[PDB]
Design a protein around this ligand. Sequence first.
Ligand SMILES: Nc1ncnc2c1ncn2[C@@H]1O[C@H](COP(=O)(O)O)[C@@H](OP(=O)(O)O)[C@H]1O
Ligand SMILES: [Mg+2]
Length: 254
Amino acid sequence: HHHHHDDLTDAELAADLAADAGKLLLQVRAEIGFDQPWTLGEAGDRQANSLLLRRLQAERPGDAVLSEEAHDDLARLKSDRVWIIDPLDGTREFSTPGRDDWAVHIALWRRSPEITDAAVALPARGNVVYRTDTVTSAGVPGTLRIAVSATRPPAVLHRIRQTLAIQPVSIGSAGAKAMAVIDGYVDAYLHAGGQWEWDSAAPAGVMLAAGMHASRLDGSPLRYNQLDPYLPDLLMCRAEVAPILLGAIADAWR
Ligand SMILES: Nc1ncnc2c1ncn2[C@@H]1O[C@H](COP(=O)(O)O)[C@@H](OP(=O)(O)O)[C@H]1O
Ligand SMILES: [Mg+2]
């Protein structure tokens, strides 16, 4: 087609990088197999990262990149365009036979909603790719399904469950849990206790593009391209359930 107002829009590129890294991760899984989960996870992280950095340098040579699997030289702090990527989110689950709760996260941050374009691939689920440019956008829910980490679920859940009826759904991957909200498999994804920008940036972009809610647990906006890319808590959910959950979280501090 004509150039937007090989060359892709940033959203198309986000989507194409996510799929391509997804295919490579699927190849790595088939090749290395599961006998040594540490070895499998390492190669997954490293090979996906290599592919992503190669393609970003070739196809967006002027953009900065923040990746979990690369040293951070902080030049991004001066740029107006920064790719925030997780080459493999849910390394643990990827490394486990039969599991499909792992993801590739490709977010574009642009200086000003700072995550303007994003994609989340779930390679083991037919390599589906959720993208900000094609995702589309209720009531009083007496009981809530909330996706939480299968490894390190947040302690604050215990407190809010004293007053809200909640069933926690234990799932790996920030990306997988966020897309479960998009799918309607759960009502919300709640995390506390630690995380990094690459874990949530692409899922946040997609969530917001879908007209859904994405914020810090205290309700304040998720902020990206920070000096310290540590970003330890989030709420992602249907718009309707955000005041209920944000309120319950707030009341947990009373
Ligand atoms: N308390 C914590 N501190 C730091 N990172 C965390 C964390 N809890 C979860 N994460 C990261 O968030 C991602 C999804 O976690 P989970 O599967 O537990 O929900 C994983 O990233 P990676 O797999 O990219 O390393 C995991 O390492
Ligand atoms: Mg990772």
